[PDB]
Each structure stands twice: as C-alpha cells, then as structure tokens.
Amino acid sequence: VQLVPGARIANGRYRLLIFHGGVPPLQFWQALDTALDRQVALTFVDPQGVLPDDVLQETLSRTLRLSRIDKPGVARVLDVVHTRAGGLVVAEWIRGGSLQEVADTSPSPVGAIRAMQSLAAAADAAHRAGVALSIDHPSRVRVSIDGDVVLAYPATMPDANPQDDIRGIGASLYALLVNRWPLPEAGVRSGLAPAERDTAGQPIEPADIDRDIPFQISAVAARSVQGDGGIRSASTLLNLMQQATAVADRTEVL
C-alpha cells in the first residue's frame, strides 16, 4: 500500500499529517484523530509486512509492557491496533517540538540537561520493569512545552536494550548541546549532522566543541554516549544528571 499525508488509516479514524521519519520497518507519523479531533503520534510497526510474525508479536508485547509505565518521559499509549498497514501504536500527541527543531536553537545547556531528566527517569522505570525505550534515533523523542524530553513514538522491538537506551539518551543530550547526532545513523529523515569523531572513533566531547558548556554537563553527555562503558544504568545516569544540574544552577549566574 502507501502512506502519505492525507492517507486515512484504521477504518478512517486517523488522517496522516506529517512524516517524522523512523528506523525501518518503523515509521513515525503525526496524525489527526478525526473521531476525537485532536492530534496523535502514530508509530507504524511494519507497513510493508517484512517482519516475521514472531518478531511483530514480541514488539507489540514489549511495547504494551512499556505502555503501563506512567511517567512524563514517555508518551501515553492510547491504543494498539492491527490495521490495513500493519501493527499500529497510537500515542498521545506531545505539544512542543521535535528533538531536531529544539537543538537548532542552541538552547541553554542547563535547560537541556534539566529537560533530559524526564527521559532518564522514564528509562529507569522501564528498565526496572524489564522493557527498553528504544531511544535509537532522534525522531523518537520530542521536547514538550513544559520542558520535558519525551519518548513520543513508543515501539520497542527485540533489539532494544537498557544499555543502548543510556547511549541513546546521551545521544539526545549531545544533540541539544551541539546540534549533532553522535550515533552512526540507522534512519530515514534524521535531520541532524553527524558528530565530529576524534582519532579513536569516540565523538568529540561537547565542552571541547564549545567551552561555554559546563564541564559536568558535557561529561554526562560523553560518558553516556560511549558504550565503551562507564554509566550502566538509567538510575545512575539520572543522579549524574541531577548533580550536574545543581552545580549548574549555582554556577549559572557566574
């Protein structure tokens, strides 16, 4: 079939508006719910049917498992339906902007790390619940008006794991900090340039690229983005985020 703006999906209930990219076979869409007249976040799980039913089923399952976690870091799942275009994960629409859009406004460092805490925290409840967020691509998250960073398009496939979440979270923090995506790219419609690599392949640290960025805040970004090691828990990740914040509010004025 075909997915393009205007399409009507699910007995026509949803009309597509904007394509927000994804990591195939996933597709992140912005759509209008014509029965309740309000926007929703569609995650299509497999438009072309390329997935073995076994993987599909595990994907819905882990997504559902993620759904019952109620934290501001994750969009609320409204439904999970099978449509003419494959499995479909319907989520509330988060007012604000994409992760791409906000980073292009070189936002305050302190404002950025502070806003990431909702993401790290939701990560933590998830992991403690045995399910990953799958922060694998910048389109996956938005920034809400209320200054939270949110998993907008839920859809947790088999490959998603806690450790990749920590990496993906920092890859977001990094994005806000330097408007660059320090991860290889497994995407369509990424919208963000790649991060400069040092000689050892590790991304150049945020502070070195812009010495205005407090040291603590650039540390949490880099020690997190590298799967090399260091941070190995949303739990710890959050606390680092929090200490980095306190140091920063104090020092902020100066």
Coordinates of N, CA and C in Angstrom, one line a residue:
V1 N 0.8 -1.2 0.0 CA 0.0 0.0 0.0 C 0.9 1.3 0.0
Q2 N 0.3 2.4 0.4 CA 1.1 3.6 0.5 C 0.7 4.5 1.7
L3 N 1.7 5.1 2.3 CA 1.5 6.0 3.4 C 2.0 7.4 3.0
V4 N 1.1 8.3 2.9 CA 1.4 9.7 2.6 C 0.4 10.7 3.2
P5 N 0.8 12.0 3.4 CA -0.1 12.9 4.1 C -1.5 12.8 3.5
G6 N -2.5 12.8 4.3 CA -3.9 12.7 3.8 C -4.4 11.3 3.9
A7 N -3.6 10.3 3.8 CA -4.0 8.9 4.0 C -5.0 8.8 5.1
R8 N -6.0 7.9 5.0 CA -6.9 7.6 6.1 C -6.6 6.2 6.7
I9 N -6.3 6.1 7.9 CA -5.9 4.8 8.5 C -6.8 4.3 9.6
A10 N -7.2 3.0 9.6 CA -7.9 2.4 10.7 C -9.4 2.7 10.6
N11 N -10.0 2.2 9.6 CA -11.4 2.4 9.4 C -11.6 3.9 9.3
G12 N -10.5 4.6 8.7 CA -10.5 6.0 8.5 C -10.4 6.9 9.7
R13 N -10.3 6.4 10.9 CA -10.2 7.2 12.1 C -9.1 8.2 12.1
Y14 N -7.9 7.8 11.5 CA -6.8 8.7 11.6 C -6.4 9.2 10.3
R15 N -6.1 10.5 10.2 CA -5.6 11.0 8.9 C -4.1 11.4 9.1
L16 N -3.3 11.0 8.2 CA -1.9 11.3 8.3 C -1.6 12.8 8.1
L17 N -0.7 13.4 8.8 CA -0.4 14.8 8.5 C 1.1 15.0 8.1
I18 N 2.0 14.6 9.0 CA 3.4 14.8 8.8 C 4.1 13.5 9.1
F19 N 5.1 13.2 8.2 CA 6.0 12.1 8.4 C 7.2 12.6 9.2
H20 N 7.6 11.9 10.3 CA 8.6 12.3 11.2 C 9.8 11.4 11.1
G21 N 9.9 10.5 10.1 CA 11.0 9.6 10.0 C 10.9 8.3 10.8
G22 N 11.9 7.5 10.9 CA 11.9 6.3 11.6 C 13.1 5.4 11.3
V23 N 13.0 4.2 11.8 CA 14.1 3.2 11.6 C 13.5 1.9 11.0
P24 N 13.6 1.7 9.7 CA 12.8 0.7 9.1 C 12.8 -0.7 9.7
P25 N 11.7 -1.3 10.0 CA 10.4 -1.0 9.3 C 9.5 -0.1 10.0
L26 N 9.9 0.5 11.1 CA 9.2 1.5 11.9 C 8.9 2.8 11.1
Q27 N 7.8 3.4 11.3 CA 7.5 4.8 10.7 C 6.8 5.7 11.6
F28 N 7.4 6.9 11.9 CA 6.9 7.9 12.9 C 6.1 9.0 12.2
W29 N 4.8 9.0 12.5 CA 3.9 9.9 11.9 C 3.1 10.8 12.8
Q30 N 2.8 12.0 12.3 CA 2.0 13.0 13.1 C 0.6 13.0 12.4
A31 N -0.4 12.6 13.1 CA -1.7 12.4 12.5 C -2.9 13.0 13.4
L32 N -4.0 13.2 12.7 CA -5.2 13.7 13.3 C -6.2 12.6 13.6
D33 N -6.7 12.6 14.8 CA -7.7 11.6 15.2 C -9.1 12.2 15.0
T34 N -9.7 11.9 13.8 CA -10.9 12.6 13.4 C -12.2 12.2 14.2
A35 N -12.1 11.3 15.1 CA -13.2 11.0 16.0 C -13.2 11.8 17.2
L36 N -12.0 12.2 17.7 CA -11.9 12.9 18.9 C -11.3 14.3 18.7
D37 N -11.1 14.6 17.4 CA -10.5 15.9 16.9 C -9.4 16.3 17.8
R38 N -8.2 15.6 17.7 CA -7.0 16.0 18.4 C -5.9 15.2 17.8
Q39 N -4.7 15.7 17.9 CA -3.6 15.0 17.3 C -3.1 13.8 18.0
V40 N -2.5 12.9 17.3 CA -1.9 11.7 17.9 C -0.5 11.4 17.3
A41 N 0.3 10.6 18.0 CA 1.6 10.2 17.5 C 1.4 8.7 17.0
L42 N 1.4 8.5 15.7 CA 1.4 7.1 15.2 C 2.7 6.5 15.1
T43 N 2.9 5.3 15.6 CA 4.1 4.5 15.2 C 3.6 3.3 14.5
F44 N 3.9 3.2 13.2 CA 3.5 2.1 12.4 C 4.6 1.0 12.6
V45 N 4.3 -0.2 12.9 CA 5.3 -1.1 13.2 C 5.9 -1.9 11.9
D46 N 5.1 -2.0 10.9 CA 5.6 -2.8 9.7 C 4.7 -2.6 8.5
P47 N 4.8 -1.4 7.9 CA 3.9 -1.1 6.7 C 4.0 -2.1 5.5
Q48 N 5.2 -2.6 5.3 CA 5.5 -3.5 4.2 C 5.4 -5.0 4.5
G49 N 5.2 -5.3 5.8 CA 4.9 -6.7 6.2 C 6.1 -7.5 6.2
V50 N 7.3 -6.9 6.2 CA 8.6 -7.5 6.0 C 8.9 -8.3 7.3
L51 N 8.2 -8.2 8.4 CA 8.5 -8.8 9.7 C 7.9 -10.2 9.8
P52 N 8.7 -11.2 10.3 CA 8.2 -12.5 10.7 C 7.2 -12.3 11.8
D53 N 6.0 -13.0 11.8 CA 5.0 -12.6 12.8 C 5.6 -12.7 14.2
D54 N 6.6 -13.5 14.4 CA 7.2 -13.8 15.7 C 7.8 -12.5 16.3
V55 N 8.5 -11.8 15.5 CA 9.1 -10.5 15.9 C 8.0 -9.5 16.1
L56 N 7.0 -9.4 15.2 CA 6.0 -8.5 15.4 C 5.4 -8.6 16.8
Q57 N 4.9 -9.8 17.1 CA 4.2 -10.1 18.4 C 5.0 -9.8 19.6
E58 N 6.3 -10.0 19.6 CA 7.2 -9.6 20.7 C 7.4 -8.1 20.8
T59 N 7.1 -7.4 19.7 CA 7.3 -6.0 19.6 C 6.1 -5.3 20.2
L60 N 4.9 -5.8 19.9 CA 3.7 -5.3 20.5 C 3.7 -5.5 22.0
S61 N 4.2 -6.7 22.4 CA 4.2 -7.2 23.7 C 5.1 -6.3 24.6
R62 N 6.3 -6.1 24.1 CA 7.2 -5.3 24.9 C 6.8 -3.8 24.9
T63 N 6.1 -3.4 23.8 CA 5.6 -2.1 23.8 C 4.5 -1.9 24.8
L64 N 3.5 -2.9 24.8 CA 2.5 -2.9 25.9 C 3.1 -2.9 27.2
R65 N 4.1 -3.7 27.4 CA 4.8 -3.7 28.7 C 5.2 -2.3 29.1
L66 N 5.8 -1.6 28.1 CA 6.3 -0.2 28.2 C 5.1 0.8 28.5
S67 N 4.0 0.4 28.0 CA 2.8 1.3 27.9 C 2.3 1.6 29.3
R68 N 2.2 0.6 30.2 CA 1.7 0.6 31.5 C 2.5 1.4 32.5
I69 N 3.8 1.7 32.1 CA 4.6 2.6 32.8 C 4.1 4.1 32.6
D70 N 3.7 4.7 33.7 CA 3.2 6.1 33.6 C 4.2 7.1 34.2
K71 N 4.9 7.7 33.3 CA 5.9 8.7 33.6 C 5.9 9.7 32.5
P72 N 6.3 11.0 32.8 CA 6.3 12.1 31.9 C 7.3 11.9 30.7
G73 N 8.3 11.0 30.9 CA 9.3 10.8 29.9 C 8.8 10.1 28.7
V74 N 7.7 9.3 28.9 CA 7.1 8.6 27.8 C 5.6 9.0 27.5
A75 N 5.4 9.2 26.2 CA 4.1 9.4 25.7 C 3.1 8.3 26.1
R76 N 1.9 8.7 26.4 CA 0.9 7.7 26.8 C 0.3 7.0 25.6
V77 N 0.4 5.7 25.7 CA -0.2 4.8 24.6 C -1.7 4.9 24.7
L78 N -2.4 5.1 23.6 CA -3.8 5.2 23.7 C -4.5 4.0 23.2
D79 N -3.8 3.3 22.2 CA -4.3 2.1 21.6 C -3.2 1.3 20.9
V80 N -3.5 0.1 20.6 CA -2.6 -0.7 19.8 C -3.5 -1.6 18.9
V81 N -3.4 -1.3 17.6 CA -4.4 -1.9 16.7 C -3.7 -2.5 15.5
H82 N -4.4 -3.5 14.9 CA -3.9 -4.0 13.6 C -4.7 -3.3 12.5
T83 N -4.0 -2.7 11.6 CA -4.7 -2.0 10.5 C -4.4 -2.6 9.1
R84 N -4.9 -1.9 8.1 CA -4.6 -2.3 6.7 C -3.0 -2.1 6.5
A85 N -2.4 -1.4 7.3 CA -0.9 -1.1 7.2 C 0.0 -1.7 8.2
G86 N -0.5 -2.7 8.9 CA 0.3 -3.4 9.9 C 0.0 -2.9 11.3
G87 N 0.7 -3.5 12.2 CA 0.5 -3.1 13.6 C 0.7 -1.6 13.8
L88 N 0.0 -1.0 14.7 CA 0.0 0.4 14.9 C 0.0 0.8 16.3
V89 N 0.9 1.6 16.7 CA 0.9 2.1 18.1 C 0.5 3.5 18.3
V90 N -0.7 3.7 18.8 CA -1.2 5.1 18.9 C -0.9 5.7 20.3
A91 N -0.3 6.9 20.2 CA 0.1 7.6 21.4 C -0.4 9.0 21.4
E92 N -0.5 9.6 22.6 CA -1.0 11.0 22.8 C 0.0 11.9 22.0
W93 N -0.5 13.0 21.6 CA 0.4 14.0 20.9 C 1.0 15.0 21.9
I94 N 2.3 15.1 21.8 CA 3.0 15.9 22.7 C 3.3 17.3 22.1
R95 N 2.7 18.3 22.7 CA 2.9 19.7 22.2 C 4.3 20.2 22.6
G96 N 5.0 20.8 21.7 CA 6.3 21.3 21.8 C 7.0 21.3 20.5
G97 N 8.2 20.7 20.4 CA 8.8 20.4 19.1 C 9.7 19.2 19.1
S98 N 10.0 18.7 17.9 CA 10.9 17.6 17.8 C 12.3 17.9 18.4
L99 N 13.1 16.8 18.5 CA 14.4 17.0 19.1 C 15.3 17.8 18.2
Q100 N 15.2 17.5 16.9 CA 15.8 18.3 15.8 C 15.6 19.7 15.9
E101 N 14.3 20.2 16.0 CA 13.9 21.6 16.0 C 14.5 22.4 17.2
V102 N 14.4 21.8 18.3 CA 14.9 22.5 19.6 C 16.4 22.7 19.6
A103 N 17.1 21.6 19.2 CA 18.6 21.7 19.2 C 19.2 22.8 18.2
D104 N 18.4 23.1 17.2 CA 18.8 24.1 16.2 C 18.6 25.5 16.8
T105 N 18.2 25.6 18.0 CA 18.1 26.9 18.7 C 19.1 27.0 19.8
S106 N 20.2 26.2 19.7 CA 21.3 26.3 20.6 C 20.8 26.7 22.0
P107 N 19.9 25.9 22.6 CA 19.3 26.2 23.9 C 20.3 26.1 25.0
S108 N 20.0 26.8 26.1 CA 20.8 26.8 27.3 C 21.2 25.4 27.6
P109 N 22.5 25.2 27.9 CA 23.0 23.9 28.4 C 22.2 23.4 29.7
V110 N 22.1 24.3 30.7 CA 21.4 23.9 31.9 C 20.0 23.5 31.6
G111 N 19.3 24.3 30.7 CA 17.9 24.0 30.3 C 17.8 22.6 29.6
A112 N 18.9 22.2 28.9 CA 18.9 21.0 28.2 C 19.1 19.8 29.1
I113 N 20.1 19.8 29.9 CA 20.3 18.7 30.8 C 19.1 18.5 31.8
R114 N 18.6 19.6 32.2 CA 17.4 19.6 33.1 C 16.2 19.0 32.5
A115 N 16.1 19.2 31.2 CA 14.9 18.7 30.5 C 15.1 17.2 30.1
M116 N 16.3 16.7 30.2 CA 16.6 15.3 29.8 C 16.2 14.4 31.0
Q117 N 16.1 15.0 32.2 CA 15.9 14.2 33.3 C 14.6 13.3 33.3
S118 N 13.6 13.9 32.6 CA 12.3 13.1 32.4 C 12.6 11.9 31.5
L119 N 13.5 12.1 30.5 CA 13.8 10.9 29.7 C 14.6 9.9 30.5
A120 N 15.6 10.3 31.2 CA 16.4 9.3 32.0 C 15.6 8.6 33.1
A121 N 14.6 9.3 33.6 CA 13.8 8.7 34.7 C 12.8 7.7 34.2
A122 N 12.2 8.0 33.1 CA 11.3 7.0 32.4 C 12.1 5.8 32.0
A123 N 13.3 6.0 31.5 CA 14.2 4.9 31.2 C 14.3 4.0 32.4
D124 N 14.6 4.6 33.5 CA 14.8 3.9 34.8 C 13.6 3.0 35.2
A125 N 12.4 3.6 35.1 CA 11.2 2.8 35.5 C 11.0 1.7 34.5
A126 N 11.3 2.0 33.2 CA 11.2 1.0 32.2 C 12.1 -0.2 32.5
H127 N 13.4 0.0 32.5 CA 14.4 -1.0 32.8 C 14.1 -1.8 34.1
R128 N 13.6 -1.1 35.1 CA 13.2 -1.8 36.4 C 12.0 -2.7 36.1
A129 N 11.4 -2.4 35.0 CA 10.2 -3.2 34.6 C 10.5 -4.1 33.5
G130 N 11.7 -4.2 33.1 CA 12.2 -5.2 32.1 C 11.9 -4.9 30.6
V131 N 11.8 -3.7 30.3 CA 11.5 -3.3 28.9 C 12.3 -2.0 28.6
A132 N 12.7 -1.9 27.3 CA 13.5 -0.8 26.9 C 12.7 0.3 26.3
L133 N 13.2 1.5 26.2 CA 12.5 2.6 25.5 C 12.7 2.5 24.0
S134 N 14.0 2.2 23.6 CA 14.5 2.1 22.3 C 14.7 3.5 21.7
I135 N 15.5 4.3 22.5 CA 15.9 5.6 22.0 C 17.0 5.4 21.0
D136 N 16.6 5.2 19.8 CA 17.6 4.7 18.7 C 17.8 5.7 17.6
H137 N 17.1 6.8 17.6 CA 17.0 7.7 16.5 C 16.4 9.0 17.0
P138 N 16.9 10.2 16.7 CA 16.5 11.5 17.2 C 14.9 11.7 17.0
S139 N 14.3 11.2 16.0 CA 12.9 11.4 15.8 C 12.0 10.8 17.0
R140 N 12.7 9.9 17.7 CA 12.0 9.1 18.7 C 11.5 10.0 19.9
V141 N 12.2 11.1 20.1 CA 11.8 12.0 21.2 C 11.4 13.4 20.8
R142 N 10.6 14.0 21.6 CA 10.3 15.4 21.4 C 10.6 16.2 22.7
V143 N 10.5 17.5 22.6 CA 10.6 18.3 23.8 C 9.2 19.0 24.0
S144 N 8.6 18.8 25.2 CA 7.2 19.3 25.4 C 7.3 20.7 25.8
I145 N 6.2 21.5 25.7 CA 6.2 22.9 26.1 C 6.7 23.0 27.5
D146 N 6.2 22.0 28.3 CA 6.6 22.0 29.7 C 8.0 21.6 30.0
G147 N 8.8 21.6 29.0 CA 10.2 21.4 29.1 C 10.7 20.0 29.5
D148 N 9.9 19.0 29.1 CA 10.3 17.6 29.3 C 10.8 17.0 28.0
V149 N 11.7 16.0 28.1 CA 12.1 15.3 26.9 C 11.4 13.9 26.9
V150 N 10.6 13.7 25.8 CA 9.7 12.6 25.9 C 9.8 11.5 24.8
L151 N 9.7 10.3 25.2 CA 9.6 9.2 24.2 C 8.2 9.3 23.5
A152 N 8.2 10.1 22.4 CA 6.9 10.3 21.7 C 6.4 9.2 20.8
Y153 N 7.3 8.5 20.1 CA 6.9 7.3 19.4 C 7.3 6.0 20.0
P154 N 6.4 5.5 20.9 CA 6.7 4.2 21.5 C 6.6 3.1 20.4
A155 N 7.4 2.0 20.6 CA 7.6 0.9 19.7 C 8.9 0.3 20.0
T156 N 8.9 -0.7 20.9 CA 10.1 -1.3 21.4 C 10.3 -2.6 20.7
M157 N 11.2 -2.7 19.7 CA 11.4 -4.0 19.1 C 12.4 -4.9 19.9
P158 N 12.6 -6.1 19.5 CA 13.6 -7.1 20.1 C 15.0 -6.5 20.4
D159 N 15.5 -5.7 19.4 CA 16.9 -5.3 19.5 C 17.2 -4.3 20.6
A160 N 16.1 -3.7 21.1 CA 16.2 -2.6 22.1 C 16.6 -3.1 23.4
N161 N 17.6 -2.5 24.0 CA 18.2 -2.9 25.3 C 18.5 -1.7 26.2
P162 N 18.5 -1.9 27.5 CA 18.9 -0.9 28.5 C 20.1 -0.1 28.1
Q163 N 21.2 -0.8 27.9 CA 22.5 -0.1 27.6 C 22.4 0.7 26.4
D164 N 21.7 0.3 25.4 CA 21.5 1.2 24.2 C 20.7 2.4 24.5
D165 N 19.8 2.2 25.4 CA 19.0 3.3 25.9 C 19.8 4.5 26.5
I166 N 20.7 4.1 27.5 CA 21.6 5.1 28.1 C 22.4 5.8 27.0
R167 N 22.9 5.1 26.0 CA 23.6 5.6 24.9 C 22.7 6.5 24.1
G168 N 21.5 6.1 23.8 CA 20.6 6.9 23.0 C 20.1 8.2 23.7
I169 N 20.0 8.1 25.0 CA 19.6 9.3 25.8 C 20.7 10.4 25.8
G170 N 21.9 10.0 26.1 CA 23.0 10.9 25.9 C 23.2 11.4 24.4
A171 N 22.8 10.6 23.5 CA 22.9 11.0 22.1 C 21.9 12.1 21.8
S172 N 20.9 12.2 22.7 CA 19.9 13.2 22.7 C 20.5 14.5 23.4
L173 N 21.1 14.3 24.6 CA 21.6 15.4 25.3 C 22.7 16.0 24.5
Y174 N 23.5 15.2 23.8 CA 24.5 15.7 22.9 C 23.9 16.5 21.8
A175 N 22.8 16.1 21.3 CA 22.2 16.8 20.2 C 21.8 18.2 20.6
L176 N 21.1 18.3 21.7 CA 20.8 19.6 22.2 C 22.0 20.5 22.4
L177 N 23.1 19.9 22.9 CA 24.3 20.6 23.2 C 25.1 21.1 22.0
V178 N 25.1 20.3 20.9 CA 25.9 20.7 19.8 C 25.2 20.6 18.4
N179 N 23.9 20.3 18.5 CA 23.1 20.1 17.2 C 23.7 19.0 16.3
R180 N 24.3 18.0 16.9 CA 24.9 16.9 16.2 C 24.5 15.5 16.8
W181 N 24.3 14.5 15.9 CA 23.9 13.2 16.3 C 25.1 12.2 16.3
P182 N 25.7 11.9 17.4 CA 26.9 11.2 17.6 C 26.8 9.7 17.3
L183 N 25.6 9.3 16.8 CA 25.5 7.8 16.6 C 25.4 7.5 15.0
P184 N 26.0 6.4 14.6 CA 26.2 6.1 13.2 C 25.0 6.5 12.2
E185 N 23.8 6.4 12.6 CA 22.6 6.6 11.8 C 22.0 5.3 11.3
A186 N 20.8 5.0 11.7 CA 20.0 3.8 11.1 C 18.7 4.4 10.8
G187 N 18.6 5.4 9.9 CA 17.4 6.2 9.8 C 17.1 6.7 8.4
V188 N 15.8 7.1 8.3 CA 15.4 7.9 7.2 C 14.9 9.2 7.9
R189 N 15.3 10.3 7.4 CA 14.8 11.6 7.9 C 15.4 12.1 9.2
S190 N 16.7 11.7 9.4 CA 17.4 12.0 10.7 C 17.3 13.5 11.0
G191 N 17.8 14.3 10.1 CA 17.7 15.8 10.2 C 18.8 16.4 11.0
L192 N 19.8 15.7 11.4 CA 20.9 16.2 12.2 C 22.2 15.7 11.7
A193 N 23.2 16.6 11.4 CA 24.5 16.3 11.0 C 25.2 15.3 12.0
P194 N 26.2 14.5 11.5 CA 26.9 13.6 12.4 C 27.9 14.4 13.3
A195 N 28.3 13.8 14.4 CA 29.2 14.5 15.3 C 30.6 14.2 14.9
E196 N 31.5 15.2 15.1 CA 32.9 15.1 14.8 C 33.5 13.9 15.6
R197 N 34.2 13.1 15.0 CA 34.9 11.9 15.6 C 36.3 12.4 16.0
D198 N 36.8 11.9 17.2 CA 38.2 12.1 17.5 C 39.0 11.0 16.7
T199 N 40.2 10.8 17.1 CA 41.1 9.8 16.4 C 40.7 8.4 16.8
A200 N 40.1 8.2 18.0 CA 39.8 6.8 18.5 C 38.3 6.5 18.1
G201 N 37.6 7.3 17.4 CA 36.3 7.0 16.9 C 35.2 7.5 17.8
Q202 N 35.6 7.8 19.1 CA 34.7 8.4 20.0 C 34.3 9.8 19.6
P203 N 33.1 10.2 19.8 CA 32.7 11.5 19.4 C 33.4 12.6 20.2
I204 N 33.8 13.7 19.6 CA 34.4 14.8 20.3 C 33.5 15.3 21.4
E205 N 34.1 15.5 22.6 CA 33.2 15.9 23.8 C 32.6 17.3 23.6
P206 N 31.4 17.4 24.1 CA 30.6 18.6 24.0 C 31.4 19.9 24.4
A207 N 32.0 19.9 25.6 CA 32.7 21.0 26.1 C 33.9 21.4 25.1
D208 N 34.6 20.5 24.6 CA 35.8 20.8 23.7 C 35.3 21.5 22.5
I209 N 34.0 21.2 22.1 CA 33.5 21.8 20.9 C 32.9 23.2 21.2
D210 N 32.7 23.5 22.5 CA 32.1 24.8 22.9 C 32.4 24.9 24.4
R211 N 33.4 25.6 24.8 CA 33.9 25.6 26.2 C 32.9 26.4 27.1
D212 N 31.8 26.9 26.6 CA 30.8 27.5 27.4 C 30.0 26.5 28.2
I213 N 29.9 25.3 27.6 CA 29.2 24.1 28.2 C 29.9 23.6 29.4
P214 N 29.3 23.8 30.6 CA 29.9 23.4 31.9 C 30.5 22.0 31.8
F215 N 31.5 21.8 32.6 CA 32.2 20.5 32.4 C 31.3 19.4 32.8
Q216 N 30.6 19.5 33.9 CA 29.8 18.4 34.4 C 28.7 18.0 33.3
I217 N 28.1 19.0 32.7 CA 27.1 18.7 31.7 C 27.7 18.0 30.4
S218 N 28.9 18.4 30.0 CA 29.5 17.8 28.8 C 30.0 16.3 29.2
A219 N 30.3 16.1 30.4 CA 30.8 14.8 30.9 C 29.6 13.8 30.8
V220 N 28.5 14.1 31.4 CA 27.3 13.3 31.4 C 26.9 12.9 30.0
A221 N 27.2 13.8 29.1 CA 26.9 13.6 27.6 C 27.8 12.6 27.0
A222 N 29.1 12.7 27.3 CA 30.1 11.8 26.6 C 30.3 10.5 27.3
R223 N 30.4 10.4 28.6 CA 30.4 9.2 29.4 C 29.2 8.3 29.2
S224 N 28.2 8.9 28.6 CA 26.9 8.2 28.4 C 26.8 7.8 27.0
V225 N 27.3 8.6 26.0 CA 27.2 8.3 24.6 C 28.1 7.1 24.2
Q226 N 29.2 7.0 24.9 CA 30.1 5.9 24.7 C 29.7 4.6 25.4
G227 N 29.4 3.6 24.6 CA 29.1 2.2 25.1 C 30.3 1.6 25.7
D228 N 31.5 2.2 25.4 CA 32.8 1.8 25.9 C 32.6 1.4 27.3
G229 N 31.8 2.1 28.1 CA 31.4 1.7 29.4 C 31.1 3.0 30.3
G230 N 31.5 2.9 31.5 CA 31.1 3.9 32.5 C 29.7 3.7 32.9
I231 N 28.8 4.6 32.5 CA 27.5 4.6 33.0 C 26.7 3.4 32.5
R232 N 26.1 2.6 33.4 CA 25.5 1.4 33.0 C 24.1 1.2 33.7
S233 N 23.4 2.3 33.9 CA 22.1 2.3 34.5 C 21.4 3.7 34.4
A234 N 20.2 3.7 33.9 CA 19.4 4.9 33.9 C 19.5 5.5 35.3
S235 N 19.3 4.6 36.3 CA 19.4 5.0 37.7 C 20.6 6.0 37.9
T236 N 21.8 5.5 37.8 CA 23.0 6.3 38.0 C 23.0 7.5 37.0
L237 N 22.5 7.3 35.8 CA 22.5 8.3 34.8 C 21.8 9.5 35.3
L238 N 20.6 9.3 35.9 CA 19.8 10.3 36.4 C 20.5 11.2 37.4
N239 N 21.0 10.5 38.4 CA 21.7 11.2 39.5 C 22.9 12.1 39.0
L240 N 23.6 11.6 38.1 CA 24.6 12.4 37.4 C 24.0 13.6 36.8
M241 N 22.8 13.4 36.2 CA 22.1 14.5 35.5 C 21.8 15.5 36.6
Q242 N 21.4 15.0 37.7 CA 20.9 15.8 38.8 C 22.0 16.7 39.5
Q243 N 23.1 16.1 39.8 CA 24.3 16.7 40.4 C 24.8 17.8 39.4
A244 N 25.0 17.3 38.2 CA 25.4 18.3 37.1 C 24.5 19.5 37.1
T245 N 23.2 19.3 37.4 CA 22.2 20.4 37.4 C 22.4 21.4 38.6
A246 N 22.6 20.8 39.8 CA 22.8 21.7 41.0 C 24.0 22.6 40.9
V247 N 25.2 21.9 40.6 CA 26.4 22.6 40.2 C 26.1 23.7 39.2
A248 N 25.3 23.4 38.2 CA 25.0 24.4 37.2 C 24.1 25.6 37.5
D249 N 23.0 25.3 38.3 CA 22.1 26.4 38.7 C 23.0 27.4 39.6
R250 N 23.8 26.9 40.5 CA 24.6 27.7 41.3 C 25.6 28.6 40.5
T251 N 26.4 27.8 39.7 CA 27.4 28.4 38.8 C 26.8 29.3 37.7
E252 N 25.6 28.9 37.3 CA 24.8 29.5 36.2 C 25.0 31.0 36.0
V253 N 24.6 31.8 37.1 CA 24.7 33.2 37.1 C 26.2 33.7 36.8
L254 N 27.1 33.0 37.3 CA 28.5 33.3 37.0 C 29.0 32.6 35.8

